[PDB]
């Protein structure tokens, strides 16, 4: 629900789909890769 913000202070809510997009950005992938493929990543994750 809040990613990593609650470990440094107050828990700050953000939608999870947006949490995943920041995480791809942290590894050098542009954030539209998730937003345009949200269903594919969620379905592939669920099987994995």
């Amino acid at each position: 629900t809040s990613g990593w913000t609650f470990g440094a202070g107050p828990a700050l809510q953000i939608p999870f789909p947006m949490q995943m997009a920041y995480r791809f950005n942290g590894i050098g992938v542009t954030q539209n890769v998730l937003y345009e493929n949200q269903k594919l990543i969620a379905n592939q994750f669920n099987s994995a």
Partner: peptide, 21 residues
Amino acid sequence: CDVVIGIVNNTVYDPLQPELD
């Protein structure tokens, strides 16, 4: 803007267009 889910409609301001024109 027809593949991302959750898009909202809003105006994006370009600073060049007004001043230039």
